[PDB]
Amino acid sequence: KLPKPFFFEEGKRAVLLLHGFTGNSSDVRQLGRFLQKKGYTSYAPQYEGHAAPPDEILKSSPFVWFKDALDGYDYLVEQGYDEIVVAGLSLGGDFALKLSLNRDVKGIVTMCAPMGGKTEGAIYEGFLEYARNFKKYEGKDQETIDNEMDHFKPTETLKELSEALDTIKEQVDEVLDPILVIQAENDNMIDPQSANYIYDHVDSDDKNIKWYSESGHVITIDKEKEQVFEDIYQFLESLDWSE
Ligand SMILES: [Ca+2]
Ligand SMILES: [Ca+2]
């Protein structure tokens, strides 16, 4: 079956977990379980059209996906959690930055968040591979997959994704809340220098950047995730929680 949002309720300190483009909640579930073991509540929404046939992404929009992130914050508040850190992977990291400008958070974690809307190359081919692997998961023959991929038109989606990323890059200088920037040194999906840009251009008074030398882009499921989780926990423990 396909992943669904998850909601692990423990103490009153809460973390909103935002996944990446073409990702879903399974990319942050292990982080959610780690946070739960450390006593933090977490909620991981899913963007419209994700965890679903890839055509549903083509019918959706980054503008909807950011409202899905905002809806996740508002859900935590409706469920009784007022103090919230937003932690985002890849596109979700950009959304975490932008969400902090739209909602009160105690802190921000960005994890391999791109700065800038270059979609040519790795992100384009990553989207196509995502669509091909889903069609295989649908049990489709190789001929139907090939035929269907010749009619898969990702251009408009990638253009909106590009414009959303560019807009957020120009909002980085408005970010004020405490921040942990996490980045894989050998990221083959985005430019790892994006992390230096975020770290240097946010206006936060409390910031930290951490580099990981043996992980790929999806750092929350790769081989150093235990250290990433520990570093996130140390950040969370440093923040201005009321309890
Ligand atoms: Ca409830
Ligand atoms: Ca600006």
Ligand SMILES: [Ca+2]
């Ligand atoms: Ca300053």
Ligand SMILES: [Ca+2]
């Ligand atoms: Ca700090």
